[PDB]
């Protein structure tokens, strides 16, 4: 569509409006928005926030009193534009310039002793989470979209902890191989301990799809001696192929309102909802709906459904002003819904799509579950537990078990397509540690309460 944001990048034209681009490598996307999302893992003793800030800066936000839900997943993300330095004779990382998104698409070199004009490679978003099990639970069921991953493998610790084994188990489940293991704390770790940790890394990466992955050490605790990553963030650049044109679907991860008390009538704005667009191209002025809508237990007990709709008026990414958004990264929309429903992330776990793109809305379902750990008990008949779907946590009620199969009803309405993933966690001790996951087999539809006046 049309997107400039800042005079650093040129403005796209809202005239053609053609999906024929269909390329992750477009001039006004690799510089404009981060369509390629990369995850970072490593659990404890590394502090990935520091290394993420070293390239982008301060990330992640909260609200303290989230209100209403208080269960929305605390997933954080940031944006960075990598642009390698151009030099006829660059002793790498002298061919590196990557920093934040402020710098234009092709920046004029000002390095001492050389000149020119260097281009970029690809806009990249980084995603992380300050919790161990929640991050794997959330990307297990197709909520965190990514194309590659990184590991910090803390150097200020003993031999790789079982957290690492959990991480390799999760990525083995995910069937992804574009994972870069990055040694940590090389400044405090001496040569002998560095060799020992390297040998342990090689001895533990075997038997996994992550075997043979590039390993490189970074002194991240001091955020100094960062040259190696400064060169291999450009050198290690795997192709993230992506398909764009289809139908617009989105998952809301958070919501809020920008209005402030004392505002007059003429300056009232609608609520804003930010999430991740899964597939399709969203358009300004387009038609969008949310299938679950408002739930209202009537005298019968049936919900109200009501997939309310309103035309989208404004879209943006980070600080720039973008129109005709594309899949990849995390985007917010300033829809025209009244802010009294969009305030303080009132309802999370919804869906967002064009008219006529309403999927099935089943509440009774059947699943195929898989155990992960060794020895474990089979699924319990007529049990209460917690289920996690998309970005949504609720307390279900499993009804029947056909040995390695289960049929379960939900206490709350849920909008899902058949064949997606699901996570199951049991209430134990003083929390719910995750037990397992599965794929939904088939679903009996809830009462069709989609209705209008």
């Amino acid at each position: 569509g049309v997107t400039l944001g800042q005079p650093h990048l040129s403005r796209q034209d809202l005239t053609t409006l053609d999906v024929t681009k269909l390329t992750p490598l477009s001039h006004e996307v690799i510089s404009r928005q981060a369509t390629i999302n990369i995850g970072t893992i490593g659990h404890v003793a590394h502090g990935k926030s520091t290394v993420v800030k070293a390239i982008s800066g301060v990330h992640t936000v909260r609200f303290k009193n989230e209100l209403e839900r208080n269960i929305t997943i605390k997933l954080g993300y940031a944006n960075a534009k990598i642009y390698k330095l151009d030099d006829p004779s660059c002793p790498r990382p002298e061919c590196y310039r990557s920093c934040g998104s402020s710098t234009p698409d092709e920046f004029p070199t000002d390095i001492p002793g050389t000149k020119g004009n260097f281009k970029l490679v690809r806009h990249v978003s980084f995603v992380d989470c300050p919790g161990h099990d929640i991050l794997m639970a959330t990307m297990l069921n197709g909520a965190a979209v990514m194309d590659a991953a990184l590991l910090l493998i803390a150097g200020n610790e003993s031999c790789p902890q079982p957290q690492t084994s959990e991480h390799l188990a999760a990525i083995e489940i995910m069937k992804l191989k574009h994972i870069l293991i990055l040694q940590n704390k090389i400044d405090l770790v001496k040569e002998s301990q560095a060799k020992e940790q390297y040998e342990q890394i090689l001895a533990f990466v075997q038997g996994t799809v992550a075997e043979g992955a590039p390993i490189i050490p970074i002194s991240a605790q001091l955020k100094y001696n960062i040259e190696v990553v400064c060169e291999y963030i450009v050198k290690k650049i795997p192709v993230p192929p992506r398909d764009f044109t289809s139908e617009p679907r989105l998952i809301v991860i958070r919501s809020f309102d920008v209005n402030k008390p004392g505002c007059e009538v003429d300056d009232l704005k609608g609520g804003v909802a930010g999430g991740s667009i899964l597939k399709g191209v969203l358009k300004v002025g387009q038609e969008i709906e949310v299938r679950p809508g408002i739930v209202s237990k009537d005298s019968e007990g049936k919900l109200m459904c009501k997939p309310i709709f309103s035309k989208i008026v404004s879209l943006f990414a980070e600080h720039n002003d973008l129109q005709y958004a594309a899949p990849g990264g995390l985007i917010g929309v300033g829809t025209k819904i009244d802010p009294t429903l969009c305030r303080a992330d009132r309802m999370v776990g919804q869906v967002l799509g064009a008219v006529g793109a309403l999927p099935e809305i089943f509440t009774e379902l059947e699943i195929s579950y898989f155990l992960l750990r060794a020895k474990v008990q089979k699924l319990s008949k007529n049990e209460v537990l917690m289920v996690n779907i998309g970005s949504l946590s609720t307390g279900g009620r499993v009804s029947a078990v056909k040995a390695d199969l289960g049929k379960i009803v939900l206490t709350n309405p849920v909008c899902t397509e058949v064949g997606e993933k699901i996570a199951l966690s049991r209430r134990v001790e003083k929390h719910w540690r995750l037990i397992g996951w599965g794929q939904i087999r088939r679903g009996v539809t809830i009462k069709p309460t989609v209705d209008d006046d």
């Binding site: 660059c90 002793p91 790498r92 090389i186 400044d187 040569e191 560095a194 390993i215 490189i216 050490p217 002194s219 100094y224 001696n225 040259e227 190696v228 050198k235």
Partner: peptide
């Protein structure tokens, strides 16, 4: 560091280790 197309791991280890400690 002498070339550009790919690099040896341990060569870069030695280079960075020498750079950080002495100079």
């Amino acid at each position: 560091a002498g070339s550009e197309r790919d690099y040896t791991y341990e060569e870069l280890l030695n280079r960075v280790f020498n750079i950080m400690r002495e100079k």
